[PDB]
Amino acid sequence: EEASSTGRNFNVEKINGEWHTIILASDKREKIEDNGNFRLFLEQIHVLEKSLVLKFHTVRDEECSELSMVADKTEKAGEYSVTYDGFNTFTIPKTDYDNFLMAHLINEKDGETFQLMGLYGREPDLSSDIKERFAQLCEEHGILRENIIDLSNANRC
Ligand SMILES: COc1nccnc1CC(C)C
Ligand code: NA
Ligand code: NA
Ligand code: NA
Ligand code: NA
């Protein structure tokens, strides 16, 4: 069974726990390239009453650094906002809770904006079929595959 955070049957408690960044995508590719602020490796999602605590690590010169962020529910169901390198809002267009989670985020900084899409897995990698489903979801948002970066070969410290 699958759901979308904006859907009526979404059960947020079911996305609690361990997650790993498998693939990131963006219509501003530099944001997720080696030195980008959005090249974030998710570790866990802690589900609270009206927020999600997101725990990540970032990488620089082969050195990991821990980063935690709190995302608050907005006025629209299934949407959350969080301040990080500008103002972000995001939703989870598709997840099956037990294997993958696909997120779509809009960042706004210095009067500009860009889209970020992320595929996270319960294990450190996902099947090629799920990775293809993610590439299709990116295409529906106008993000070319050349702007999709598989990070499954570099998501561990
Ligand atoms: C700031 O959030 C993020 N930034 C980079 C990568 N992934 C996320 C998780 C979101 C999309 C739910
Ligand atoms: Na580039
Ligand atoms: Na909106
Ligand atoms: Na969408
Ligand atoms: Na969206």
Short mmCIF file of N, CA and C and ligand atoms in Angstrom, two decimals:
data_model
loop_
_atom_site.label_atom_id
_atom_site.label_comp_id
_atom_site.label_asym_id
_atom_site.label_seq_id
_atom_site.Cartn_x
_atom_site.Cartn_y
_atom_site.Cartn_z
N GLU A 1 0.87 -1.23 0.00
CA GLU A 1 0.00 0.00 0.00
C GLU A 1 0.88 1.26 0.00
N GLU A 2 0.48 2.26 -0.76
CA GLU A 2 1.25 3.48 -0.85
C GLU A 2 0.44 4.68 -0.50
N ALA A 3 1.10 5.77 -0.16
CA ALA A 3 0.32 6.94 0.18
C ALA A 3 1.12 8.17 -0.13
N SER A 4 0.45 9.31 -0.08
CA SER A 4 1.03 10.61 -0.30
C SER A 4 0.72 11.37 0.99
N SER A 5 1.61 12.25 1.42
CA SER A 5 1.36 12.98 2.65
C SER A 5 0.14 13.89 2.51
N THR A 6 -0.18 14.27 1.29
CA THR A 6 -1.33 15.17 1.08
C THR A 6 -2.63 14.37 0.94
N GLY A 7 -2.53 13.04 0.93
CA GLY A 7 -3.71 12.18 0.79
C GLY A 7 -4.46 11.93 2.09
N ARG A 8 -5.73 11.56 1.95
CA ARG A 8 -6.57 11.32 3.11
C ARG A 8 -6.15 10.09 3.93
N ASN A 9 -5.53 9.09 3.32
CA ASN A 9 -5.16 7.90 4.11
C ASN A 9 -3.74 7.91 4.65
N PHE A 10 -3.04 9.04 4.54
CA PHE A 10 -1.65 9.11 5.03
C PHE A 10 -1.53 8.87 6.53
N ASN A 11 -0.56 8.04 6.92
CA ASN A 11 -0.35 7.75 8.33
C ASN A 11 1.08 8.17 8.65
N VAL A 12 1.24 9.39 9.12
CA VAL A 12 2.59 9.95 9.36
C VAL A 12 3.42 9.15 10.32
N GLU A 13 2.79 8.50 11.28
CA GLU A 13 3.57 7.70 12.21
C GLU A 13 4.41 6.62 11.49
N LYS A 14 3.90 6.12 10.37
CA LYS A 14 4.56 5.06 9.64
C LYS A 14 5.86 5.50 8.92
N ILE A 15 6.16 6.80 8.84
CA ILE A 15 7.46 7.21 8.25
C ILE A 15 8.50 7.45 9.35
N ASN A 16 8.13 7.19 10.60
CA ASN A 16 9.09 7.33 11.69
C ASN A 16 10.23 6.32 11.55
N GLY A 17 11.44 6.72 11.96
CA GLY A 17 12.55 5.78 12.05
C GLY A 17 13.68 5.95 11.10
N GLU A 18 14.35 4.83 10.85
CA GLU A 18 15.53 4.84 10.01
C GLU A 18 15.25 5.12 8.53
N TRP A 19 16.08 6.00 7.93
CA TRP A 19 16.02 6.29 6.51
C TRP A 19 17.44 6.60 6.05
N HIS A 20 17.67 6.46 4.74
CA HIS A 20 18.95 6.77 4.14
C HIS A 20 18.71 7.52 2.83
N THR A 21 19.58 8.49 2.55
CA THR A 21 19.46 9.17 1.23
C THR A 21 19.96 8.27 0.14
N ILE A 22 19.10 7.97 -0.84
CA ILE A 22 19.50 7.12 -1.96
C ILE A 22 19.79 7.95 -3.20
N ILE A 23 18.87 8.84 -3.52
CA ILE A 23 19.07 9.67 -4.70
C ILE A 23 18.58 11.08 -4.40
N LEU A 24 19.28 12.11 -4.88
CA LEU A 24 18.77 13.50 -4.76
C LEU A 24 18.65 14.07 -6.18
N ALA A 25 17.72 15.02 -6.37
CA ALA A 25 17.54 15.61 -7.71
C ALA A 25 17.18 17.07 -7.54
N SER A 26 17.51 17.89 -8.53
CA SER A 26 17.19 19.32 -8.38
C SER A 26 17.20 20.03 -9.70
N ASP A 27 16.32 21.01 -9.88
CA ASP A 27 16.44 21.82 -11.08
C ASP A 27 17.56 22.90 -10.95
N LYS A 28 18.29 22.93 -9.85
CA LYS A 28 19.51 23.79 -9.69
C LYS A 28 20.53 22.76 -9.18
N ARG A 29 21.15 22.05 -10.12
CA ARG A 29 22.04 20.92 -9.77
C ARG A 29 23.16 21.23 -8.77
N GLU A 30 23.67 22.46 -8.76
CA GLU A 30 24.78 22.75 -7.83
C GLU A 30 24.44 22.61 -6.38
N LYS A 31 23.13 22.68 -6.04
CA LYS A 31 22.68 22.60 -4.66
C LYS A 31 22.87 21.22 -4.07
N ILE A 32 22.97 20.19 -4.94
CA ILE A 32 23.17 18.84 -4.47
C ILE A 32 24.49 18.22 -4.92
N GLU A 33 25.33 19.01 -5.57
CA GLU A 33 26.65 18.52 -6.01
C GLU A 33 27.57 18.52 -4.82
N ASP A 34 28.81 18.05 -5.01
CA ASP A 34 29.75 17.92 -3.89
C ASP A 34 29.76 19.00 -2.83
N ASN A 35 29.78 20.24 -3.21
CA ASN A 35 29.80 21.15 -2.08
C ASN A 35 28.46 21.80 -1.74
N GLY A 36 27.37 21.26 -2.26
CA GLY A 36 26.11 21.91 -2.05
C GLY A 36 25.50 21.77 -0.71
N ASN A 37 24.73 22.77 -0.30
CA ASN A 37 24.16 22.74 1.05
C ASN A 37 23.03 21.74 1.15
N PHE A 38 22.52 21.29 0.01
CA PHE A 38 21.41 20.32 0.03
C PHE A 38 21.81 18.87 -0.24
N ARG A 39 23.10 18.62 -0.27
CA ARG A 39 23.58 17.25 -0.45
C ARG A 39 23.56 16.68 0.99
N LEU A 40 22.35 16.33 1.44
CA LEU A 40 22.13 15.88 2.79
C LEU A 40 21.82 14.42 2.85
N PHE A 41 22.51 13.76 3.78
CA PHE A 41 22.33 12.31 3.99
C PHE A 41 21.42 12.05 5.19
N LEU A 42 20.17 11.67 4.91
CA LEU A 42 19.23 11.46 5.96
C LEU A 42 19.60 10.22 6.76
N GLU A 43 19.31 10.28 8.08
CA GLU A 43 19.62 9.15 8.98
C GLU A 43 18.36 8.66 9.68
N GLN A 44 17.52 9.62 10.08
CA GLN A 44 16.26 9.29 10.71
C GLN A 44 15.24 10.38 10.70
N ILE A 45 13.98 9.97 10.86
CA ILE A 45 12.87 10.91 10.94
C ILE A 45 12.18 10.61 12.24
N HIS A 46 12.11 11.57 13.16
CA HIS A 46 11.38 11.34 14.38
C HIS A 46 10.01 12.08 14.25
N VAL A 47 8.91 11.32 14.29
CA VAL A 47 7.58 11.88 14.10
C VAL A 47 7.04 12.36 15.43
N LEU A 48 6.73 13.65 15.50
CA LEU A 48 6.13 14.23 16.71
C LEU A 48 4.69 14.68 16.40
N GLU A 49 3.99 15.21 17.41
CA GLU A 49 2.62 15.63 17.22
C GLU A 49 2.37 16.54 16.01
N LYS A 50 3.13 17.60 15.91
CA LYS A 50 2.94 18.56 14.83
C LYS A 50 4.25 18.90 14.14
N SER A 51 5.21 17.98 14.19
CA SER A 51 6.50 18.26 13.54
C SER A 51 7.24 16.98 13.25
N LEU A 52 8.29 17.09 12.44
CA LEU A 52 9.18 15.97 12.16
C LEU A 52 10.60 16.40 12.56
N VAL A 53 11.35 15.58 13.29
CA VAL A 53 12.72 15.96 13.57
C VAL A 53 13.57 15.20 12.56
N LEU A 54 14.30 15.92 11.70
CA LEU A 54 15.09 15.27 10.66
C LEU A 54 16.55 15.24 11.05
N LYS A 55 17.14 14.05 11.13
CA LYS A 55 18.57 13.98 11.46
C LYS A 55 19.37 13.57 10.24
N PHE A 56 20.37 14.38 9.89
CA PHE A 56 21.22 14.18 8.71
C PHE A 56 22.67 14.22 9.04
N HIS A 57 23.46 13.87 8.04
CA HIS A 57 24.88 14.21 8.14
C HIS A 57 25.26 14.82 6.80
N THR A 58 26.28 15.66 6.82
CA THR A 58 26.75 16.25 5.59
C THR A 58 28.19 15.78 5.46
N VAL A 59 28.77 15.96 4.28
CA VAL A 59 30.14 15.49 4.06
C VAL A 59 30.99 16.61 3.46
N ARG A 60 32.25 16.70 3.87
CA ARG A 60 33.16 17.72 3.35
C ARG A 60 34.58 17.21 3.55
N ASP A 61 35.37 17.20 2.48
CA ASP A 61 36.76 16.73 2.54
C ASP A 61 36.84 15.34 3.20
N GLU A 62 35.86 14.48 2.90
CA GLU A 62 35.81 13.14 3.45
C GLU A 62 35.55 13.14 4.97
N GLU A 63 34.88 14.18 5.47
CA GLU A 63 34.57 14.26 6.91
C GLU A 63 33.06 14.52 7.14
N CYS A 64 32.41 13.67 7.91
CA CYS A 64 30.98 13.79 8.19
C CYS A 64 30.69 14.74 9.35
N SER A 65 29.58 15.47 9.25
CA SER A 65 29.18 16.36 10.31
C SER A 65 27.70 16.13 10.52
N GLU A 66 27.28 16.09 11.77
CA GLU A 66 25.88 15.88 12.08
C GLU A 66 25.07 17.16 11.94
N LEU A 67 23.85 17.04 11.45
CA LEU A 67 22.95 18.19 11.28
C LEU A 67 21.52 17.73 11.63
N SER A 68 20.82 18.48 12.48
CA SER A 68 19.45 18.15 12.90
C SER A 68 18.61 19.35 12.54
N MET A 69 17.36 19.11 12.19
CA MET A 69 16.45 20.15 11.75
C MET A 69 15.07 19.78 12.20
N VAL A 70 14.23 20.77 12.51
CA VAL A 70 12.86 20.49 12.89
C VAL A 70 11.90 21.04 11.84
N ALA A 71 11.04 20.19 11.29
CA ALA A 71 10.09 20.63 10.27
C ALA A 71 8.71 20.69 10.90
N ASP A 72 8.06 21.83 10.75
CA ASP A 72 6.75 22.02 11.33
C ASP A 72 5.63 21.86 10.32
N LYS A 73 4.50 21.33 10.77
CA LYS A 73 3.35 21.25 9.87
C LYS A 73 2.89 22.66 9.47
N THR A 74 2.46 22.82 8.23
CA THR A 74 1.96 24.13 7.78
C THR A 74 0.45 24.02 7.80
N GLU A 75 -0.21 25.01 7.20
CA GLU A 75 -1.67 25.00 7.15
C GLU A 75 -2.21 23.99 6.16
N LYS A 76 -1.37 23.51 5.26
CA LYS A 76 -1.91 22.51 4.35
C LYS A 76 -1.51 21.11 4.81
N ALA A 77 -2.47 20.19 4.86
CA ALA A 77 -2.16 18.84 5.33
C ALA A 77 -1.10 18.16 4.48
N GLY A 78 -0.19 17.50 5.16
CA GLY A 78 0.89 16.82 4.47
C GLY A 78 2.02 17.72 4.06
N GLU A 79 1.96 19.02 4.37
CA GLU A 79 3.09 19.91 4.01
C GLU A 79 3.77 20.33 5.31
N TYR A 80 5.09 20.44 5.24
CA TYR A 80 5.89 20.84 6.37
C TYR A 80 6.82 21.97 5.91
N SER A 81 7.22 22.82 6.85
CA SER A 81 8.17 23.90 6.52
C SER A 81 9.38 23.81 7.45
N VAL A 82 10.53 24.26 6.96
CA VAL A 82 11.71 24.28 7.79
C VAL A 82 12.70 25.30 7.31
N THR A 83 13.32 26.00 8.25
CA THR A 83 14.32 26.97 7.84
C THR A 83 15.70 26.30 7.75
N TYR A 84 16.32 26.39 6.58
CA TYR A 84 17.65 25.84 6.36
C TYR A 84 18.11 26.41 5.02
N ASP A 85 19.19 27.19 5.04
CA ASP A 85 19.69 27.83 3.82
C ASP A 85 18.53 28.44 3.01
N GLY A 86 17.70 29.21 3.71
CA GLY A 86 16.53 29.84 3.14
C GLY A 86 15.30 29.20 3.78
N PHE A 87 14.15 29.43 3.16
CA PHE A 87 12.86 28.92 3.68
C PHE A 87 12.40 27.74 2.82
N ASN A 88 12.12 26.60 3.44
CA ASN A 88 11.71 25.41 2.69
C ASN A 88 10.35 24.90 3.06
N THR A 89 9.62 24.37 2.06
CA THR A 89 8.37 23.69 2.35
C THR A 89 8.52 22.36 1.62
N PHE A 90 7.96 21.30 2.19
CA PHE A 90 8.02 20.05 1.44
C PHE A 90 6.82 19.14 1.72
N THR A 91 6.61 18.17 0.81
CA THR A 91 5.56 17.20 0.95
C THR A 91 6.18 15.85 0.61
N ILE A 92 5.44 14.77 0.87
CA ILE A 92 5.92 13.44 0.49
C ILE A 92 4.91 12.90 -0.54
N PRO A 93 5.17 13.10 -1.85
CA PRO A 93 4.25 12.63 -2.89
C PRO A 93 4.01 11.12 -2.93
N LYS A 94 5.01 10.33 -2.52
CA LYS A 94 4.80 8.87 -2.56
C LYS A 94 5.68 8.16 -1.54
N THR A 95 5.11 7.24 -0.76
CA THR A 95 5.94 6.41 0.11
C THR A 95 5.19 5.10 0.30
N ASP A 96 5.91 3.98 0.50
CA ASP A 96 5.20 2.74 0.82
C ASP A 96 5.56 2.37 2.27
N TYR A 97 6.12 3.35 2.97
CA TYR A 97 6.50 3.27 4.40
C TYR A 97 7.60 2.27 4.73
N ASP A 98 7.56 1.07 4.13
CA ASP A 98 8.49 -0.01 4.43
C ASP A 98 9.74 -0.11 3.59
N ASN A 99 9.76 0.56 2.44
CA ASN A 99 10.93 0.54 1.60
C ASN A 99 11.42 1.94 1.24
N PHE A 100 10.52 2.73 0.62
CA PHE A 100 10.97 4.05 0.12
C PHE A 100 10.10 5.21 0.52
N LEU A 101 10.69 6.40 0.40
CA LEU A 101 10.01 7.65 0.69
C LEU A 101 10.48 8.64 -0.35
N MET A 102 9.55 9.25 -1.10
CA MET A 102 9.92 10.27 -2.09
C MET A 102 9.39 11.60 -1.60
N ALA A 103 10.27 12.60 -1.52
CA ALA A 103 9.91 13.94 -1.04
C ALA A 103 10.13 14.96 -2.12
N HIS A 104 9.28 16.00 -2.08
CA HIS A 104 9.44 17.12 -3.03
C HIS A 104 9.53 18.38 -2.15
N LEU A 105 10.56 19.17 -2.37
CA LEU A 105 10.80 20.35 -1.55
C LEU A 105 10.99 21.58 -2.45
N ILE A 106 10.50 22.73 -1.96
CA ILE A 106 10.71 24.01 -2.66
C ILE A 106 11.53 24.89 -1.69
N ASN A 107 12.66 25.39 -2.16
CA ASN A 107 13.49 26.28 -1.33
C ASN A 107 13.35 27.68 -1.87
N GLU A 108 13.41 28.65 -0.96
CA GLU A 108 13.35 30.04 -1.40
C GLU A 108 14.45 30.75 -0.59
N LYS A 109 15.39 31.40 -1.31
CA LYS A 109 16.53 32.12 -0.67
C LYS A 109 16.87 33.30 -1.54
N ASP A 110 17.07 34.44 -0.89
CA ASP A 110 17.46 35.66 -1.57
C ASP A 110 16.55 36.00 -2.73
N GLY A 111 15.25 35.72 -2.56
CA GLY A 111 14.29 36.04 -3.60
C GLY A 111 14.21 35.09 -4.79
N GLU A 112 15.00 34.02 -4.74
CA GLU A 112 15.05 32.98 -5.81
C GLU A 112 14.30 31.72 -5.31
N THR A 113 14.29 30.68 -6.13
CA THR A 113 13.67 29.42 -5.68
C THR A 113 14.29 28.29 -6.50
N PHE A 114 14.13 27.07 -5.99
CA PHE A 114 14.51 25.87 -6.77
C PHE A 114 13.75 24.69 -6.18
N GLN A 115 13.65 23.61 -6.96
CA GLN A 115 12.99 22.39 -6.53
C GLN A 115 14.05 21.34 -6.16
N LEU A 116 13.80 20.60 -5.08
CA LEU A 116 14.65 19.47 -4.70
C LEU A 116 13.74 18.26 -4.54
N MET A 117 14.18 17.09 -5.04
CA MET A 117 13.41 15.86 -4.88
C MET A 117 14.35 14.86 -4.27
N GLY A 118 13.83 14.02 -3.37
CA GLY A 118 14.75 13.09 -2.70
C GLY A 118 14.10 11.71 -2.63
N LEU A 119 14.92 10.67 -2.80
CA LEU A 119 14.43 9.28 -2.67
C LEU A 119 15.23 8.72 -1.50
N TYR A 120 14.52 8.30 -0.46
CA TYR A 120 15.15 7.77 0.75
C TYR A 120 14.67 6.31 0.93
N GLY A 121 15.55 5.50 1.46
CA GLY A 121 15.22 4.10 1.66
C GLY A 121 15.41 3.64 3.08
N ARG A 122 14.66 2.60 3.48
CA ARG A 122 14.84 2.04 4.81
C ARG A 122 16.21 1.41 4.95
N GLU A 123 16.72 0.81 3.86
CA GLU A 123 18.10 0.29 3.82
C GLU A 123 18.97 1.29 3.10
N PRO A 124 20.29 1.07 3.08
CA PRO A 124 21.14 2.03 2.38
C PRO A 124 21.05 2.07 0.84
N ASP A 125 20.22 1.24 0.23
CA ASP A 125 20.03 1.28 -1.22
C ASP A 125 18.57 0.82 -1.47
N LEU A 126 18.16 0.93 -2.73
CA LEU A 126 16.82 0.53 -3.16
C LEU A 126 16.95 -0.20 -4.48
N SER A 127 15.89 -0.89 -4.88
CA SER A 127 15.87 -1.65 -6.14
C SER A 127 15.93 -0.70 -7.34
N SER A 128 16.39 -1.21 -8.47
CA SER A 128 16.46 -0.37 -9.65
C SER A 128 15.03 -0.01 -10.07
N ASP A 129 14.03 -0.87 -9.81
CA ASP A 129 12.64 -0.50 -10.20
C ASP A 129 12.15 0.73 -9.41
N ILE A 130 12.45 0.79 -8.11
CA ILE A 130 12.03 1.96 -7.33
C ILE A 130 12.81 3.20 -7.80
N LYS A 131 14.08 3.04 -8.17
CA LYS A 131 14.87 4.17 -8.62
C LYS A 131 14.27 4.69 -9.92
N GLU A 132 13.77 3.79 -10.76
CA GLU A 132 13.12 4.22 -12.02
C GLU A 132 11.79 4.95 -11.73
N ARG A 133 11.02 4.48 -10.76
CA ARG A 133 9.78 5.16 -10.37
C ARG A 133 10.11 6.59 -9.89
N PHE A 134 11.24 6.76 -9.20
CA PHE A 134 11.63 8.08 -8.75
C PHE A 134 11.99 8.97 -9.95
N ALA A 135 12.70 8.41 -10.91
CA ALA A 135 13.06 9.20 -12.11
C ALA A 135 11.79 9.64 -12.83
N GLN A 136 10.76 8.80 -12.85
CA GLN A 136 9.50 9.21 -13.43
C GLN A 136 8.83 10.34 -12.62
N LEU A 137 8.90 10.29 -11.29
CA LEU A 137 8.27 11.33 -10.50
C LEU A 137 9.06 12.66 -10.79
N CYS A 138 10.40 12.57 -10.90
CA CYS A 138 11.20 13.79 -11.18
C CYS A 138 10.78 14.38 -12.52
N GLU A 139 10.60 13.52 -13.52
CA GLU A 139 10.16 13.97 -14.87
C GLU A 139 8.82 14.71 -14.81
N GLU A 140 7.92 14.27 -13.96
CA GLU A 140 6.63 14.94 -13.83
C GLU A 140 6.80 16.31 -13.20
N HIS A 141 7.96 16.61 -12.61
CA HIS A 141 8.22 17.94 -12.05
C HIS A 141 9.22 18.75 -12.84
N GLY A 142 9.52 18.27 -14.05
CA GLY A 142 10.41 19.01 -14.94
C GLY A 142 11.88 18.93 -14.57
N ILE A 143 12.26 17.84 -13.90
CA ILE A 143 13.67 17.67 -13.54
C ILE A 143 14.23 16.55 -14.42
N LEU A 144 15.23 16.92 -15.21
CA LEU A 144 15.88 16.01 -16.11
C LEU A 144 16.68 14.97 -15.37
N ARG A 145 16.83 13.78 -15.98
CA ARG A 145 17.62 12.76 -15.31
C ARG A 145 19.06 13.18 -15.11
N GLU A 146 19.58 14.06 -15.97
CA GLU A 146 20.97 14.46 -15.82
C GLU A 146 21.15 15.30 -14.55
N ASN A 147 20.02 15.69 -13.95
CA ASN A 147 20.01 16.45 -12.69
C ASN A 147 19.58 15.56 -11.50
N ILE A 148 19.59 14.24 -11.72
CA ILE A 148 19.29 13.28 -10.68
C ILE A 148 20.61 12.60 -10.29
N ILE A 149 20.98 12.61 -9.01
CA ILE A 149 22.29 12.05 -8.58
C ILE A 149 22.09 10.91 -7.61
N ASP A 150 22.53 9.72 -8.04
CA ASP A 150 22.44 8.55 -7.16
C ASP A 150 23.63 8.63 -6.19
N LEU A 151 23.32 8.66 -4.90
CA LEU A 151 24.31 8.80 -3.83
C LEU A 151 24.40 7.53 -3.01
N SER A 152 23.86 6.42 -3.52
CA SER A 152 23.88 5.18 -2.74
C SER A 152 25.29 4.61 -2.60
N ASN A 153 26.19 5.04 -3.46
CA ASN A 153 27.56 4.57 -3.30
C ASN A 153 28.37 5.53 -2.43
N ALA A 154 27.71 6.47 -1.73
CA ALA A 154 28.44 7.40 -0.86
C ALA A 154 27.60 7.97 0.27
N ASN A 155 26.71 7.14 0.83
CA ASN A 155 25.83 7.64 1.87
C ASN A 155 26.19 7.19 3.29
N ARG A 156 27.37 6.55 3.42
CA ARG A 156 27.86 6.11 4.72
C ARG A 156 29.15 6.85 5.12
N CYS A 157 29.30 7.13 6.43
CA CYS A 157 30.48 7.79 6.99
C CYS A 157 31.61 6.81 7.25
C1 LIG B 1 16.06 20.02 4.06
O1 LIG B 1 15.51 18.76 3.69
C2 LIG B 1 16.28 18.07 2.81
N1 LIG B 1 17.36 18.61 2.20
C3 LIG B 1 18.13 17.89 1.40
C4 LIG B 1 17.83 16.55 1.18
N2 LIG B 1 16.76 16.02 1.77
C5 LIG B 1 15.96 16.73 2.59
C6 LIG B 1 14.72 16.04 3.20
C7 LIG B 1 13.43 16.74 2.76
C8 LIG B 1 13.30 16.78 1.24
C9 LIG B 1 12.23 16.03 3.39
NA NA B 2 27.51 21.34 -11.95
NA NA B 3 1.31 26.39 -0.94
NA NA B 4 3.86 17.36 -6.96
NA NA B 5 5.10 19.44 -4.33
#
